[PDB]
Structures are given as C-alpha cells and as structure tokens.
Amino acid sequence: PLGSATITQDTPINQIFTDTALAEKMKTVLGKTNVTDTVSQTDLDQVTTLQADRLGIKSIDGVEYLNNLTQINFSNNQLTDITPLKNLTKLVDILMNNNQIADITPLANLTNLTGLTLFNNQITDIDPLKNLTNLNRLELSSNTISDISALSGLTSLQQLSFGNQVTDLKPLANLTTLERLDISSNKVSDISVLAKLTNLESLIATNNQISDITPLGILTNLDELSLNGNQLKDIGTLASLTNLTDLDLANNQISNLAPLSGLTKLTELKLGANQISNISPLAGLTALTNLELNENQLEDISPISNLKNLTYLTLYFNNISDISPVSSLTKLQRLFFANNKVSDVSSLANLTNINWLSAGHNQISDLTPLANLTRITQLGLNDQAWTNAPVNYKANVSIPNTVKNVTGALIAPATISDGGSYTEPDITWNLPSYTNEVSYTFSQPVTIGKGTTTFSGTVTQPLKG
Amino acid sequence: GPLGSWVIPPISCPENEKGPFPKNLVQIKSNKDKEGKVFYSITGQGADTPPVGVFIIERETGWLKVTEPLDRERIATYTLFSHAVSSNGNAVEDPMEILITVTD
C-alpha cells in the first residue's frame, strides 16, 4: 500500500521489532516459538489489534509494518518517540497514557482516529491533533498543556479532558457535541465559554480558581457536576440544574444552600470545607445516600433527620452538641463526627447497621450505649475532653471517676494532676493549698465488634473556693 | 487504632465505564491535615505493583481514580492500601486496606 512499510523477504521478528519486550510480545501474537523465527508481510498483515500495555517497551520500531492495525494499547510503558505510528492510517483507537511522550507530530495524519488517550505524558504542544476531526474521545490530563487552540475544530468530541496549565477555554466554543468534560487541575477562573456547551451531562472542574458559575445556567442536561476546590460562594445558578444527581462543592466559601433546595434527584452531595451554618434547605433532598458537611459552622443539624436514605455522612469539625438528629437515619453504615462537642451518644444505639463510627475529639465519657453495635469494623474514640461541674474545694478533695468502658466498668486514670491518686471508684487529691482546678487523663484500647481504637481523654475538674 | 483520623467513602467500581479517564472514584482524607499538610499515596497490585496504575491517587487532594475501564470477568477484586504522610515523610495514619469489587 502507498505510504505503508512492508517487508519483501521473510525476516526474523527480532530484526523488525528491535525492542526486546515488544519482540517477545509479537512472537506470542504471531504464534511463533522464538523471537528469531522469520515472518512474512502476510503474517504481519493479520494483526488488527494489539494489547501491549505494561510490558516495559521503550521503542515501537517495527509497528509500522502492522499496516492493518485499528486498535492499539501501549499504555503504561516507557515510550518517547512514536514515529512508527505515522502511516498507520487505519488506526481508530489509541490507548497511550502513562508514557514519556512529548512530540505527538506522528499522530497528525491519523484521520480515522475516534479515540485518543494520552494522559500522563510530557505533552505541551497539541497542534498535531488539530485535524483529527473524527475524534469522539480525547484525554490529555496530567500533561503541561497551556494552549488548547488545536481543539477548536474537533467538532465530534463527546468526551474530553486536558491539563495542567490551561487558563483560556475560548477554543471550546464550537464543540457543542461535548457531553463529558474534565478541566480539573488547570489555572481556570473564566468558564463563560461553557454556556455554549448545552449538551454537557458531566462537568468535572476541581482544583481551579472558579468563583463565577453563572455560565452553567442553561446547561440543563447536567447530571454530574464537581467544583471541589474552587472559590465559590454564590451558588444561585445551581437551582436551574434540576437534572443533577451528583454534586460536589467541597472546599469553597459557600454559606447559602437555598439554591440546592429543589434538586431532589440528588443522591450524592459534598459540601465539606465551606461556611455553612444552616442546612434547612437540604430538608427535601430525600434521595441522598451520601452527604458531606464536615468543616463548616454547624450546631443545629435537626434538618438532617429528613434524609432517611443516608448510608454515608460526615459532620467532623463543626460545633455540634446534639448528635440525636442522625439517630433516625437507620441505614447509616459510616458516620464521622470527630471534633465536635457531643457528650451523649445513646441515640446512636439505633444505628444497628453502623460499620464505621468516628467520634474522636468530642466530650464522650461513657461507651455503654454503643455496646450492641457489633457490626462495627472501624472505630475512632481518641482525644475526648470535657470539664465537670465544679465541686467544693477541701484539703482532701475526692471525686468519683466517671469514665466508663463499653462493658460498664470504670476505666482507671492514666495520669492524675497535682499528685492525685486512684482507689476505685474515687480520685483523691491532698492539696498543699487552694487551686482553681485539678485534672486527669485516661487511655484505654477498646474493640466493639471488629473496630478497634483508643478511648482516651482529658477531664478538667474545677474546685470552688 | 487502625481507623485513626481516616475518612473514606465506600468505593463503587462499575465495569465498562465511560471516559474521560482517569475517572474519580472517591476523595480520601486524613483529619491529621488540620495540624499540617498531608500527602496521600496508594500501594497494592493494581497500584504500585502489577498491573501498575489501574488505580492512582492525587497526592495533595486525596482523589482516588481508576485509569481505564475494568472487566469483572477478567479481574473481579483488588486489594489496595491508602497511606497518609506529613511534609517530613512520617506516617500520620496506619495504612488502610481498601477492597474494591468490580460490579455490573
């Protein structure tokens, strides 16, 4: 064929495919016994697909003779030079992620390409892709691309990703066929061009500098949206996106959740690391199975009782004293509320299917209400802290120890301040003078079901003069 | 104990997924990140040993991703281990076993 590379005489496999790992692969593909065995061009013409991923291949020299190749997979190798692919015009799909490729000029004349995977390479210049107008799928994340002008005429693209230095998205304007876009980990603030991409069903845009989401208003087909790690506050535009089932707004500056109130198709919602104090707008989102509300300003979490389908919930790093609103969410399997002010965990006995329970850095003094949660496999109860009600100071002051293990037995103090001692069930101090407070710590390994932790803490005891 | 300050959602890995790849599965975190920066990594067959890089984790964000379509009837299960270290390379968590099941 014109442009094609062919052998005219029968040649050893190891003289065609000079890379030692590719010669061994081609020996198996071609049904030969040794890499020195000769093959003809007719033999090489039988190869239409090649799954050569994860073989330590440094060179694809010889692949130019496989004229009938339509689909290749050379992902997870050590390729740099891809010049042997230049004239393989029958190629429709190439999987070549996780290599050391910088120069993609050999892909320029592969007009029949509908799929091209090149993520995790060393590509800056994507100009060679500009005339691959039949491409439906193109993955370019984990590269050093800053200029996407070459994408402007790829008007058949349905799935697209790129990275990691892109600021200007203007070249995407005419790519209205786009359904699934991933612009994560770029230098993007201006997503105004995305308003043109009205066929978008999935938009992943994590770890950018986005503060203005008004361009998303008419993208009514969006079912999946991730703006995790941006500069969002005003999410009013989201009320228009009624088809959303999966929404990730973690690591922003959001306080007003009213725009999410009517997005009743939501099953997964991430709102961790924001400025939220009012979750009343979430009350009607009863299809939610996963909800993340960690690292906010929450106290009154009473509206969470409406979310009866929740199996996963995070509330860690808030100002919550009353955990009882989670108690009627009986499908809960993983619950995380470390770094709160919770003392009474008795309502948690109603979460009979709980597997992961993380409650460190609270004010928990008694594990007995959790004794029957035997389906637990992961447990966290370290570093509790609370201050008891004041007791009258006397020179020989005695308080009852109140720290109780899951068995109902008192846990002996690990340390006692001001030279105090322990004779079960009382901690006694004999003080040389009046002091404002005394204290003690505890540290006790414990297992409930198959979940193991250290139940520990610091108890501060005020003494009234 | 083993859970420590880990926060891990359950992982759903359907076979024959749609791109673009890599596709996010879940975002893992250690709450030890409030006392200093945390760096995430993954080990196991399917991660650092063969098949290398089926699963990868973004070191700063904790985003665990799948790099290609999975095939139940080829490999049904993968045992991975998440790791969390500080800026000084010290393990801030005990490594967490993560059993990924390839569903329909």
Q: Where are the alpha helices (DSSP H) in A344-444?
A: none
Please choose, from the candidates A94, A104, A110, A144, the residue with its C-alpha nearest in 3D space to the C-alpha of residue A127: A104
For residue A73, the 8-state DSSP code is E
Quote the CA–CA distance of A35 and A32 in Å, as a whole number.
Answer: 7
A206 close contact with B: CB closer than 8 A: yes
∠ Cα A206 A209 A215 (to 5°): 85
| A211 to A73, A137, A183, A193, A230: CA distances (angstroms) | 39, 28, 15, 15, 7
| CATH superfamily label, B1-104 | Cadherins (2.60.40.60)
Q: What is the dihedral of CA B23, B29, B35, B40, to 10 degrees?
A: -60
C-alpha atoms less than 13 angstroms from C-alpha of B46 in its C-beta half-sphere: 24
Quote the CA–CA distance of A419 and A39 in Å, as a whole number.
Answer: 88
A136-174: b (≥16 Cβ within 10 Å) or e: bbbbbbbbebeebebbeebeebbbbbbbbebeebebbee
The full length of chain B comes to 104
- By C-alpha distance, the chain A residue nearest B8 is A334
CB contact residues (below 8 A), chain A span 331-350, against chain B: 333-334, 336, 338-339
Please choose, from the candidates A231, A285, A228, the residue with its C-alpha nearest in 3D space to the C-alpha of residue A260: A285
Quote the CA–CA distance of A65 and A18 in Å, as a whole number.
Answer: 13
Please provide the distance, in angstroms rounded to a whole number, between the alpha carbons at the two ends of chain A. Answer: 102
Q: Write the residue in B20, B31, B52 that is nearest to A161 by C-beta.
A: B20
Quote the CA–CA distance of A255 and A233 in Å, as a whole number.
Answer: 7
Quote the CA–CA distance of A349 and A310 in Å, as a whole number.
Answer: 17
* Shortest Cα–Cα distance, B67 to chain A (Å): 9
- Give phi and psi for A204, each to the nearest 5: -110, 120
B68 close contact with A: CB closer than 8 A: yes
| A43 to A5, A11, A13, A46, A441: CA distances (angstroms) | 14, 11, 11, 6, 77
Q: How many CB atoms lie within 10 A of CB A445?
A: 10
- The per-type count for chain A, helices as H runs and strands as E runs, is 3, 26
β A415-416/A437-448 pair status: antiparallel
Contact yes or no for B7 and A294 at CB 8 A: yes
Contact yes or no for A452 and B2 at CB 8 A: yes
Contact yes or no for B21 and A380 at CB 8 A: no
* Shortest Cα–Cα distance, A356 to chain B (Å): 8
DSSP string of B11-31, one letter each residue:
P-EESS--SSSSEEEEE-EEG
Residues 6+ apart with CB under 8 A from A351: A326, A327, A329, A330, A332, A335, A357, A373
Quote the CA–CA distance of B101 and B78 in Å, as a whole number.
Answer: 7
Quote the CA–CA distance of A236 and A206 in Å, as a whole number.
Answer: 19
Q: In what order do the strands lie in the sheet with B77-85?
A: B13-14, B96-103, B77-85, B39-43
Resolution of the experimentally solved model in angstroms: 1.6
The answer, yes or no, to whether the previous bond of B51 is cis (omega within 30 of 0) is yes
- Give phi and psi for A24, each to the nearest 5: -65, -40
B27 close contact with A: CB closer than 8 A: yes
∠ Cα A69 A72 A74 (to 5°): 140
The full length of chain A comes to 465
Residues 6+ apart with CB under 8 A from A202: A179, A180, A181, A222, A223, A224, A225
The domains of chain A are located at 1-383, 384-465
Tokens encoding A238: 């989201």
Quote the CA–CA distance of A53 and A406 in Å, as a whole number.
Answer: 52
Quote the CA–CA distance of A261 and A281 in Å, as a whole number.
Answer: 5
- What kind of experiment solved this structure? X-ray
Tell me which long-range contacts A405-410 makes (C-beta under 8 A, separation of at least 24).
A405/A367, A405/A368, A405/A444, A405/A446, A405/A455, A406/A367, A406/A368, A406/A370, A406/A371, A406/A446, A406/A448, A407/A368, A407/A371, A408/A368
Q: What is the dihedral of CA A335, A338, A339, A341, to 10 degrees?
A: 70
* Shortest Cα–Cα distance, B19 to chain A (Å): 6
- Positive/negative CA dihedral, A31, A34, A35, A41: negative
B chain contacts of residue A379, beta-carbon cutoff 8 Å:
1, 3
* Shortest Cα–Cα distance, A314 to chain B (Å): 8
β B29-30/B63-66 pair status: unpaired
Note whether B28 and B20 are within 8 A (CB).
no
Quote the CA–CA distance of A257 and A235 in Å, as a whole number.
Answer: 8
* CATH number, domain A1-383: 3.80.10.10
Quote the CA–CA distance of A336 and A28 in Å, as a whole number.
Answer: 52
The answer, yes or no, to whether the previous bond of B2 is cis (omega within 30 of 0) is no
Radius of gyration of chain B from its Cα atoms, rounded to whole angstroms:
14
Q: Which CATH class is domain A384-465?
A: mainly beta
